[PDB]
């Protein structure tokens, strides 16, 4: 699974860690996060995130 970055603030969503305080368990692929989830740091939506291709 790939890491995704918030292009507004640079937060990184790591699928290994998830975002458990907001209901996103470890092991959740970014595509499967509920589409009303927002960046935990800056509050923007998923449409401002991009795949971290390496
Ligand atoms: Fe952000």
Short mmCIF file of C-alpha atoms and ligand atoms in Angstrom, two decimals:
data_model
loop_
_atom_site.label_atom_id
_atom_site.label_comp_id
_atom_site.label_asym_id
_atom_site.label_seq_id
_atom_site.Cartn_x
_atom_site.Cartn_y
_atom_site.Cartn_z
CA UNK A 1 0.00 0.00 0.00
CA UNK A 2 1.24 3.47 -0.84
CA UNK A 3 1.68 6.50 1.36
CA UNK A 4 -0.35 9.61 0.45
CA UNK A 5 0.58 13.22 1.20
CA UNK A 6 -1.63 16.21 1.88
CA UNK A 7 -0.53 18.69 -0.80
CA UNK A 8 -1.68 21.64 1.32
CA UNK A 9 0.23 20.99 4.53
CA UNK A 10 2.56 18.04 3.82
CA UNK A 11 1.03 15.60 6.34
CA UNK A 12 1.65 11.99 5.28
CA UNK A 13 -0.98 9.28 5.52
CA UNK A 14 0.77 5.99 6.21
CA UNK A 15 -1.46 2.95 5.73
CA UNK A 16 0.57 0.97 8.28
CA UNK A 17 -0.41 3.44 10.99
CA UNK A 18 -3.84 4.53 9.75
CA UNK A 19 -5.48 7.46 11.56
CA UNK A 20 -7.09 5.61 14.47
CA UNK A 21 -8.26 8.66 16.43
CA UNK A 22 -10.52 9.50 13.46
CA UNK A 23 -11.70 5.94 12.90
CA UNK A 24 -9.23 4.87 10.21
CA UNK A 25 -7.63 1.62 11.34
CA UNK A 26 -4.10 0.52 10.54
CA UNK A 27 -4.06 -1.36 7.23
CA UNK A 28 -6.60 0.90 5.51
CA UNK A 29 -5.69 1.76 1.91
CA UNK A 30 -6.20 5.46 1.17
CA UNK A 31 -8.91 4.73 -1.41
CA UNK A 32 -10.95 2.94 1.28
CA UNK A 33 -10.87 5.76 3.86
CA UNK A 34 -14.42 7.15 4.04
CA UNK A 35 -14.67 10.01 1.55
CA UNK A 36 -15.67 12.58 4.18
CA UNK A 37 -12.39 12.16 6.09
CA UNK A 38 -10.16 15.23 6.24
CA UNK A 39 -6.47 15.83 6.86
CA UNK A 40 -5.88 15.63 10.61
CA UNK A 41 -3.49 18.60 10.53
CA UNK A 42 -5.06 21.13 8.16
CA UNK A 43 -8.63 19.93 7.64
CA UNK A 44 -8.76 19.74 3.85
CA UNK A 45 -10.47 16.88 2.02
CA UNK A 46 -9.07 13.77 0.36
CA UNK A 47 -9.09 15.45 -3.06
CA UNK A 48 -6.02 17.51 -2.05
CA UNK A 49 -3.96 14.37 -1.41
CA UNK A 50 -1.59 12.69 -3.86
CA UNK A 51 0.10 9.29 -3.97
CA UNK A 52 3.69 9.22 -2.74
CA UNK A 53 5.20 7.40 -5.73
CA UNK A 54 8.80 6.36 -5.04
FE1 LIG B 1 -3.14 18.76 5.43
#
